[PDB]
Design a protein around this ligand. Structure first.
Ligand code: NAG
Ligand code: CA
Ligand code: CA
Ligand code: CA
Ligand code: CA
Ligand code: CA
Ligand code: CA
Ligand code: CA
Ligand code: CL
Ligand code: CL
Lengths: 266, 263
């Protein structure tokens, strides 16, 4: 029957590999998979998932083309893209996002037991390396806030001076997995999606790391569809219903356990 | 192009501005400034009118602003309208231009600093507007066995005492008035009670938030409107540049007004 092609990128606990037995297609699991499954059921479609061949969310290149999942949508190789995709104006100009199914903000992952408790505390650091994924939306977030003397505090300017040192070479990482691994080794603080670093801290074998939030949320996570897709408004309606009934809250408790895991209190 | 805009008064989203006798009513506020930025960005003019029953809208068909859009007397509706699935099924909302959540309005100087602390109260009156969406939110959360902390169950036990008659109020203005006179905490739209606290004549109240947002505020357009996606795109741009945050600081200003954190 009606089958949608879904492009994704691995991001814990939004989209993870579940099993891949030889001969069988790869299977996936996670919070975004469960939201997608609820939509598939309600709207009566099937789907097939593939990972973005370049592994990127996607951004705009100099000739106005896009790579990543965004590019897959523009080219119509994918009908929808889902993982932990932030709804931004640049991306919405070329694809069509559903209304959000979760809020987004940036957090800090750092080993427990330090005097750093806030973004402001991190910005005061003189010797400490900290950073984000180079070439990411989070890097571009700190560029924007850091190069804006119109902010009310030097916090973002100071954070940007460390993050962007040597064009991002010294203090940034290639992937969230590298940032998480470095934060656990100590002497590094990793700045990334708070939901991603919270999951990493909750599942740390040694319960050795904690997350600093406090970022005000102004953006959400969405399902990206093709420009002009008829499914965009249908998805939004059902997402709103999932939120109103409490079904989304249950799925969040499933992947970010309120209890049973590491205690994140430093 | 001129769009018909329907609204309802809600400080500081939409407020009456001063107008010369005989001149049409003027409006000002956070939502008005968002509307103005959309007009300038997209290049339209507009005329505003007030909903005849001063209601947002609910069904049993739709009244309030939702009804004006359904009937097509309005091209769009804006004030402090929350994006809900029941409303989105009959009209078309922009993506949100601000987050919504429920807060606590309470007199300064108590040991209550969180929703959990409020839920621990014995013999204290606290509540919300009777038969409101907020009441229904606390019903749903408070009766759900899958909640991981007893906080919501305990809040519901007090809010719904005697079918909601003992501890709930008839309107937000009454809830605000009761919290200011004491021996009551009022649970309502955090942006609304924050503004009430900032402008309290006696700078006597504070607001407890510490709640992830449940919903967004949106611009409601007609079902099938050609403008909805355009509005969403420009709203996202206004958020990303910080323009909306500047507008929020402008309409919920903190210096010159009451200090909400003096204790
Ligand atoms: C756009 O730029 C990218 C990166 O250089 C390139 O791979 C792609 O072929 C270009 N496409 C054009 C000219 O349409
Ligand atoms: Ca779009
Ligand atoms: Ca120590
Ligand atoms: Ca693990
Ligand atoms: Ca449409
Ligand atoms: Ca309201
Ligand atoms: Ca609709
Ligand atoms: Ca006291
Ligand atoms: Cl929204
Ligand atoms: Cl939308």
């Amino acid at each position: 029957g009606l089958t949608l092609k879904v492009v994704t990128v691995l991001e814990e606990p939004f989209v993870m590999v579940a099993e891949n037995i030889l001969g069988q297609p790869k299977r996936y699991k996670g919070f975004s998979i469960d939201v997608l499954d609820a939509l598939a059921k309600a709207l009566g479609f099937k789907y097939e998932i593939y990972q973005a061949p370049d592994g990127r969310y996607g951004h705009q290149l100099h000739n106005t083309s896009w790579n990543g999942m965004i590019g897959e949508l523009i080219s119509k190789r994918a009908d929808l893209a889902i993982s932990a995709i932030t709804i931004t104006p640049e991306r919405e100009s070329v694809v069509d996002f559903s209304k959000r199914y979760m809020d987004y903000s940036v957090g800090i992952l750092i080993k427990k037991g330090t005097p750093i408790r806030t973004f402001q505390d991190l910005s005061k650091q003189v010797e400490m390396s900290y950073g984000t994924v180079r070439d990411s939306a989070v890097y571009e977030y700190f560029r924007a806030k850091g190069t804006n003397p119109l902010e009310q505090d030097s916090t973002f300017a100071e954070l940007w001076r460390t993050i962007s040192k040597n064009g991002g070479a010294d203090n940034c990482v290639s992937s969230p997995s590298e940032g998480i691994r470095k934060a656990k080794k100590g002497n590094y603080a990793f700045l990334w999606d708070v939901a991603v670093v919270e999951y990493a801290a909750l599942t740390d074998d040694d319960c050795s790391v904690t997350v600093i939030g406090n970022s005000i949320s102004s953006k959400g996570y969405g399902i990206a569809l093709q420009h002009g897709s008829p499914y965009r408004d249908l998805f939004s309606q059902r997402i709103l219903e999932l939120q109103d009934t409490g079904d989304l809250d249950v799925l969040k408790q499933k992947w970010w356990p309120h209890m049973g895991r590491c205690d994140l209190t430093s």
